[PDB]
Structure formats: C-alpha cells, structure tokens
Design a protein around this nucleic acid. Structure first.
Ligand code: CL
Ligand code: MG
Ligand code: MG
Ligand code: MG
Ligand code: MG
Ligand code: MG
Ligand code: MG
Length: 327
DNA sequence: CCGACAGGCGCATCAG
DNA sequence: CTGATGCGCCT
DNA sequence: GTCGG
C-alpha cells in the first residue's frame, strides 16, 4: 500500500503506545517524527543504518527497523498486543473525550469494553457520552464529495446570518485530500479583530443557525472562539442516513486570518515542524501571530503579515502550497 | 552529555 | 467566587 | 526517542 508502510505502521503503533499507555508525550512525538520522515523517504529502506541517516531516526529506531526487516515483526509490539491492560487502555482512547488518563482509570475500575462503557454512561462526561453515542460513525472517513456538500451548507447558512462572515474549510480538505477525518471551519467577521470585538455572540449566531437547519446535531464544547461538535448531512426519502460527523469551528480575528489559516490547514506534524523551525530561527508562531524571540525568551511584538507566504519568508522557508503540507 | 521538544481553547477539578 | 492546573482536544 | 549546542 505504501513504500515503507510496514516500518511506518510499526512506528505509529509505538507512538500510540507511548501516548496512550506510557503517557510519554515526547516519545509519542519522537516516534511520529520518525514515521513522518520515513514516509516521505523515496527509497525502500534496506537497513536500519540507512534509516538512521534521516533526521528524527536514531539508534533505537534503527535497531527496531533492523528487527522488523529481518523478521517481519517487532517483539516489543507483539508483547504489547497481548497485554490486556495496554490493549484495553488503547481501545478506550478511541472514544472521543477519553484520553490516556481517563482510559487507565476506567480500565482500573473494570471498564474495558464498548459494552462496559454503554452500561456506565453516568460515569462519562458530556463529551465522552457523545463520543460513545457516535463511536462507529466517528471512525468513518468523509469522502471529499460529502465534504463539498457540507461546505455548501455551512457557507450558505453563514451567509444567511451575515454576508460579512467569511467561512473557510481548512484541514485535510484545504490540502486537497480525497477524504477527511472531520470538518474544520475557520470563521472571520469584520467586527472581531485583534483590536476590538464590536459585536458579541459572533460564533454563537452561526452555531445557532446551523442547529436550526438540523446540520449541527450535538455540542461537545463551545466558547467564544471555538466550537467542537457533531453535524450530519441531510438524507433523501428511503435513504439510509449519513454518518454523524465531527465538526470544529474556530473564530479568528479578521486581521490575523493568515496565521489562522496556516494553523488550521496543518497538517499537525507540519505545524509542529514549522513552529519548531521558527523557534530555531528566533521566532514563535501561533494561530494569531508570528513574533520575534529576544535573548530572554519573551516574545516581542507581532510582525506584519498579509499572506501565508510572509510567515514562511520570516523563517526563511520556501513556500509550500497546502497540498504539500500533508503527511 | 543534556535541555528542549508547538501552541493554545474549553472543560473539569482543586485550594482558598 | 478566583486563579492555577492538567486533561483532551484541534491543526 | 532524538539531536544540536
Ligand atoms: Cl468573541
Ligand atoms: Mg479519545
Ligand atoms: Mg486530525
Ligand atoms: Mg480535519
Ligand atoms: Mg478537526
Ligand atoms: Mg436521524
Ligand atoms: Mg499541550
């Protein structure tokens, strides 16, 4: 299916173990870094020493790669796969709203199956309850055809609330992916800038309208600038319903759109790589601004930005189109 | 050898 | 009630 | 787990 798929699968599985079971986030990310650089490597890897030349692959992963190439498996992962506790904790984290901490606690309390979760909903917070309700649906991917229908609904309903809003579908969709895990919507309005909020309830307005027309069905979390919830396309007579889908909406100051869209377009690993490179170059990037770093570590004042490319220029990177920011 | 590893929103919890 | 903390999440 | 001072 992919060039070094066995190796990248192995490393991703180790990343998940370190995140979900070990609760070691830097090992998680180190494994993800290695998987990422390897996935982009345009040769079929013949040895661990060859892999070790790539940035992010060290002695330990090279050693694992040699085992995998020689035997087709990793004894370390075979052990983890048979460990009941590890498997159960891993499984529970697949429910949206259950992370490593909550999964371990549930598993300690004897709760380790979908059945167990369902007969213990009173032990779940709101988010987790909705994640359980739509467990199967949330692991389905969204065909780009459906993303396009969803975009049409969101853009048209936003326009009905106020023609001044601009809604931009970001994430994997903006990177040209033929399928997406969920929908990410960046929202701006003239009355919300970094200098003032001249109208309240800007995000609420939009969420309310999408609820009215039955597009948004559930709310996981909702503040002044970020909505996390569930939506569903309308189905026609006699047709099975579409799966429920995860949707995220982020209201960003209009004058900080470019940092906002850079953030929201990702990928996640791309953002981590780009932000880490910015730090190396003496800058810090968030979804709002790019700022210089002084000697002390105090971030300076936001630099002027009027394109995505400007952010790349500051850190001396050649521009990468959204399509080339994917894993 | 070892300090740093991206950055931040919303929620739930804790001390006072 | 604040204010601080950490979880789980987003890209 | 990795790597640049
Ligand atoms: Cl606001
Ligand atoms: Mg989860
Ligand atoms: Mg994602
Ligand atoms: Mg997405
Ligand atoms: Mg999302
Ligand atoms: Mg229905
Ligand atoms: Mg964090």
């Amino acid at each position: 299916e992919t060039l070094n798929g066995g190796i990248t699968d192995m490393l991703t599985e180790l990343a998940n173990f370190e995140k979900n079971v070990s609760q070691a986030i830097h090992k998680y990310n180190a494994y993800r870094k290695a998987a990422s650089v390897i996935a982009k490597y345009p040769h079929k890897i013949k040895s661990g020493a060859e892999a070790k030349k790539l940035p992010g692959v060290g002695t330990k992963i090279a050693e694992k790669i040699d085992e995998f190439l020689a035997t087709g498996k990793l004894r370390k992962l075979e052990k983890i796969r048979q460990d009941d506790t590890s498997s159960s904790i891993n499984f529970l984290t697949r429910v949206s709203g259950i992370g490593p901490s909550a999964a371990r606690k549930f598993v300690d309390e004897g709760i380790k199956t979908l059945e167990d979760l369902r007969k213990n909903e009173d032990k779940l917070n709101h988010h987790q309850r909705i994640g359980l309700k739509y467990f199967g649906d949330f692991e389905k991917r969204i065909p780009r055809e459906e993303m396009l229908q969803m975009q049409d609904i969101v853009l048209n309903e936003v326009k009905k609330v106020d023609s001044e809003y601009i809604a931009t579908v970001c994430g994997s969709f903006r990177r040209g992916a033929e399928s997406s895990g969920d929908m990410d919507v960046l929202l701006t309005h003239p009355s919300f800038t970094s200098e003032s909020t001249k109208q309240p309830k800007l995000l609420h307005q939009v969420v309310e309208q999408l609820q009215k027309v039955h597009f948004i069905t559930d709310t996981l979390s909702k503040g002044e600038t970020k909505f996390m919830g569930v939506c569903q396309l309308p189905s026609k007579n006699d047709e099975k319903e579409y799966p429920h889908r995860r949707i995220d909406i982020r209201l960003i100051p209009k004058d900080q759109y470019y940092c906002g869209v850079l953030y929201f377009t990702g990928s996640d690993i791309f953002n981590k790589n780009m932000r880490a490179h910015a730090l190396e170059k003496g800058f810090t990037i968030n979804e709002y601004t790019i700022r210089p770093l002084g000697v002390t570590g105090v971030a300076g004042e936001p630099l002027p930005v009027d394109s995505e490319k400007d952010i790349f220029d500051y850190i001396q990177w050649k521009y990468r189109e959204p399509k080339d920011r994917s894993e």
